[PDB]
Amino acid sequence: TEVVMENVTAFWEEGGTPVLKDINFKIERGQLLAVAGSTGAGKTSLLMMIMGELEPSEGKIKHSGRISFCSQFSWIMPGTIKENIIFGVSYDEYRYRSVIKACQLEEDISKFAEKDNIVLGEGGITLSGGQRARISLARAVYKDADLYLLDSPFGYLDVLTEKEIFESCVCKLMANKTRILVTSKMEHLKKADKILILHEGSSYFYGTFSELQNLQ
Numbered sequence: 001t002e003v004v005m006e007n008v009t010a011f012w013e014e015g016g017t018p019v020l021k022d023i024n025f026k027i028e029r030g031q032l033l034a035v036a037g038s039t040g041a042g043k044t045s046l047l048m049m050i051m052g053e054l055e056p057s058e059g060k061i062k063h064s065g066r067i068s069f070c071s072q073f074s075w076i077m078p079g080t081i082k083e084n085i086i087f088g089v090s091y092d093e094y095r096y097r098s099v100i101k102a103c104q105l106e107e108d109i110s111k112f113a114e115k116d117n118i119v120l121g122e123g124g125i126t127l128s129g130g131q132r133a134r135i136s137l138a139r140a141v142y143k144d145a146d147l148y149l150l151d152s153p154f155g156y157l158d159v160l161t162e163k164e165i166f167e168s169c170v171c172k173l174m175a176n177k178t179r180i181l182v183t184s185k186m187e188h189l190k191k192a193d194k195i196l197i198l199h200e201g202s203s204y205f206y207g208t209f210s211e212l213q214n215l216q
C-alpha cells in the first residue's frame with residue numbers, strides 16, 4: 001500500500017471542531033483516489049495531512065517517498081514558461097514535451113515567437129486563469145515523485161478541456177503513478193480506483209463508483 005488513513009481525526013485548532021473525522025482509505029501503488037465533497041469539507045486539509053502540515057489526533061497514516069503537490073490556487077514565478085514548469089528540476093526534452101502535450105500547452109506555446117522562452121510573471125504576458133492552471137499542473141506532473149497530490153487542478157477550464165486533460169495527463173501520462181486527485185466530476189470518480197466523498201470532515205462515502213451505482 002502507498003497511502004493509508006485509518007480512523008483519522010484531526011484539528012487545525014485545539015478545541016475547535018475536527019476538520020477530518022474518522023477518515024479511512026487505502027491506495028495501492030499506482031492507483032488513483034478521487035477526493036470529492038463541498039467547500040470546507042476537508043479535502044485540501046487531507047492533502048495537508050499527507051504532507052505533514054497537519055497531524056492526526058486519532059488514527060494512523062502511512063505514506064512514503066517524495067510528494068509532488070499541485071495547489072488549487074495556480075501560481076507563476078518570474079521566469080520563462082519552461083522554467084516555471086521544470087521549476088528547478090533537471091531538464092529532459094522528451095519528458096518536458098510529454099508533459100506540455102498532455103496539458104495542451106503546446107498549442108499556447110506554439111503561438112509565441114519566443115516559444116518556451118516566453119517570459120511570465122514579469123509584467124509582459126498576462127496569462128488566463130486556464131493557462132495558469134495548466135502551467136501549475138504541468139509543473140507538478142513534471143516533478144518526479146512517488147505520490148502526486150492534485151488539488152482541484154482544472155480551474156478555469158471548460159468541461160471538455162478538463163475531460164481531455166484528465167484523460168491525457170492524469171490517466172495516460174501518469175498511468176503508473178500513485179495519484180490523489182481532488183475533484184467532483186463524475187467521469188473522474190468513475191475512472192478512479194477508489195472514491196472518498198467528504199462532508200463537513202466526515203466520510204460521506206468511500207468505495208468504488210460501481211459500488212455507489214449498486215446503491216441506487
Ligand SMILES: Nc1ncnc2c1ncn2[C@H]1C[C@H](O)[C@@H](COP(=O)(O)OP(=O)(O)OP(=O)(O)O)O1
Nearest residue numbers: 012013019037038039040041042043044045046072
Ligand atoms: N491552515 C488552516 N488552518 C486553520 N484552518 C484551516 C486551514 N485550512 C483549512 N482550514 C479550515 C477551513 C475550513 O473550516 C476547514 C476545511 O478546509 P479545507 O480542507 O481547505 O476545505 P476544502 O479543501 O474541502 O474546501 P474547498 O473545496 O473550498 O477547497 O479547515
Ligand SMILES: [Mg+2]
Nearest residue numbers: 043044045072
Ligand atoms: Mg481546498
